[PDB]
Structures are given as C-alpha cells and as structure tokens.
Amino acid sequence: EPKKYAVTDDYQLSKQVLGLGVNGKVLECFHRRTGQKCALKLLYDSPKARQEVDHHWQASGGPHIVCILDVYENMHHGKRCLLIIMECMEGGELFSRIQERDQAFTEREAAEIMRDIGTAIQFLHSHNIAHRDVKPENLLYTSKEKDAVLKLTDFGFAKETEKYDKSCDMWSLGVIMYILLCGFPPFGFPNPEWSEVSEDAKQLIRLLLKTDPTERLTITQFMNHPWINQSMVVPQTPLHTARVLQEDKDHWDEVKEEMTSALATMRVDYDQV
Ligand SMILES: O=C1NCCc2[nH]c(-c3ccnc(-c4cnc5ccccc5c4)c3)cc21
C-alpha cells in the first residue's frame, strides 16, 4: 500500500492537466528512472479520498479499468494528500477519438466498445462496486494507436454495495450506447440517424433506459444480450456518429454537463417525484 516518502523522489511532475475529477486534478508526470509518462491524481486527504483510493485499487487490474501504478501519502501546501499514480491514457476520451474519424464508424464497432465497457462494469459489479458516474470524461484510451484499449476510471463516487447503485451504471451504459449509435444523447430513435440501426441495438437501449431502476437490465443480462454477447456478428453498418459529433461539437460540453447532472441526480438520497 501507500508510499509515505515524497512522490517527487520517484516522479517528475508537470503542470499539464490531463483531467478533472470530483476529488481532484489529473497531472502529467514521468517516472524518474524509467522515463514512462504517467498521470498524477492529487486527492486532498478525506474519507471520500480514502474511499476512492480504496475502490480504484481494488478495481485496478480488472479488465478495462485504468490501472494504479502507486499511491502516495504526502504533505503538499501544509495539507495531507493522496496521490494516485496511474497509467497515462494517451488516447484521450472515447468520443473525442470517434469524432476524430471521415472513416466508417460501424454498428459492430459500437458493440465492441460497449462490450468493453460492460466487461469493466461486470468486473466491478461482481466485486460489489458500483461506479455511479460512468460518463464521457471517464472513458479513456491507452494510446492514439489503432490497437488502443478502452478503460474506465475515476472511483470518486464509487460505492461498495445495492441493486439501485448498480442500476445507475446500467443506465450509463444505455446513455453511452445511445450516443455511440447516433452522436447525440437521449436527453425515441429518430431518422435519419437511427434509420439503419439493428433492432437488437434499439431493444438493448430500451431495456437499459427504463425509467424504473428495478426494470433495468443487470450487467449479466447486458453481457448475455446477443448485441453484446455476439458483438462481432453485429452488422458492419456505417453510423452517423462521428459526423454528428463533428457537426454538434459546439454543444458537446453541454451534453457532458447534463449527463453529469443526471448522474448526480441519481446519487441523491432523496429526490423529487
Ligand atoms: O479520475 C479522473 N477523473 C476524471 C478525468 C480523469 N482523467 C484521468 C486520466 C488518467 C490517465 N490519463 C489521462 C490522460 C487523458 N488524456 C490524455 C490525452 C493526451 C495525452 C495524455 C492523456 C492522458 C487521464 C483520470 C481521471
């Protein structure tokens, strides 16, 4: 577990920000003797920070989860902090990468992306962790290369559980799939964009987007759905997604912000009716 000596003994730090999570900022850094580029998450010590560390550490090593390399407990600006060192996710965000394709983005590619995410959620749900904030910011690629791996990160709202909490992940899966398939969020399946999408795909989304949490597919049901289970047999049909992502790039931040809002809403103890 946690190293009590200075992070800076092992890592050269940078001021380049790679991301922003509820509990802290993500900075680029380099391992001093290896030279490997890594990412540094600075958590000011708190029981929430300690939970994040605990949950991410448990999840680390699971399929399609951003790995922790080390964790430091340091003093920084007179305050006790935790520094999570993680693999550098040099490919950036999932949907930025889709956008940066021109090339065909096909239904089978979305099915394989969705399977990867499901495989992460499967791992987490079987270890009774619910993530509770699966969203575009948290879905990242290991490189900019063709063979990059999609991983999930940020365990700052994770909870060691509750079917309810698990169903918030299942819901994220349906939102992300929806955007994967057309380029815009569900917040029906309109033409032209949905015109050519599988009935399987649209059926899966309806089962994940149930207004009633208990009516939503569980991860096991999701992974056994033929659209996921038989993802490689899914139609190679060209989607509108990249094109739409490009066209509406100006409204992307808003999409991100209302998903964040939606997910926070699902996390409140008592909500309106
Ligand atoms: O916990 C988090 N909260 C939300 C945003 C975030 N990004 C990361 C993260 C982790 C590792 N690497 C990156 C990263 C992302 N994007 C990049 C683009 C280009 C070069 C390097 C990059 C590294 C981000 C962690 C978290």
Same domain, 123 and 215: yes
DSSP 8-state code for residue 60: T
Determine the Cα–Cα distance for residues 159 and 55; give it in Å rounded to an integer: 8
**Nearest Cα residue to 182 out of 194, 170, 191, 171:** 194
Experimental method: X-ray
Per the annotation, the verdict on 45 as an active-site residue is no
Domain enclosing residue 29, as ranges: 7-88
Same domain, 153 and 257: yes
CATH of the domain at 248: 1.10.510.10
Would you give the DSSP letter of residue 144?
Answer: S
The verdict on 78 and 127 lying in the same domain is no
Q: Where does a domain end: 50, 70, 88? A: 88
Question: What token pair was written down for 125?
Answer: 């749900």
Q: Which of 10, 116, 133, 169 is catalytic?
A: 133
Q: How far apart are alpha carbons 90 and 183 in whole angstroms?
A: 23
Distance CA 13, CA 220 (A): 41
Task: Give residue for tokens 């509406």.
Answer: 248
Q: Whose CA is nearest to atom 16 of ligand 1?
A: 92
H or E segment and range at residue 65: none
Pair (31, 152) in one structural domain: no
CA of 235 to the centre of ligand 1 (A): 32
**Using CA atoms, how far apart are residues 185 and 179, in angstroms rounded to an integer?**
5
Whether residues 76 and 205 share a domain: the answer is no
Residue 62 CB less than 6 A away from ligand 1: no
Structure tokens at 129: 């962790």
CA 18 – ligand 1 centroid, Å: 5
Establish whether residue 26 lines the binding site of ligand 1, counting it when its CB lies within 6 angstroms of any ligand atom: yes
Report CA-CA distances (Å) from 258 to 44, 174, 177, 228, 242: 27, 15, 16, 27, 20
Coil, helix or strand at residue 27: strand
- For atom 14 of ligand 1, the residue with the nearest CA is 89
Whole-angstrom CA distances from 145 to 148, 149, 174, 219, 239 are 5, 9, 27, 29, 21
Task: Tell me, using a 6 A CB cutoff, whether residue 109 lines ligand 1.
Answer: no
Q: Judge whether 27 and 81 are in contact, CB under 8 Å.
A: no
Alpha-carbon Rg for the chain, nearest whole angstrom, is 19
Contact 267, 130 (CB under 8 A): no
Using CA atoms, how far apart are residues 155 and 54, in angstroms rounded to an integer? 9
Strands 68-76 and 37-44: unpaired
- Choose among 124, 133, 150: nearest CA to 64: 150
Q: Locate the DSSP E strands across the chain.
A: 11-21, 24-31, 37-44, 68-76, 79-87, 92-93, 129-130, 139-141, 150-152, 159-160
DSSP 8-state symbol, 5: S
- Overall domain count for the chain: 2
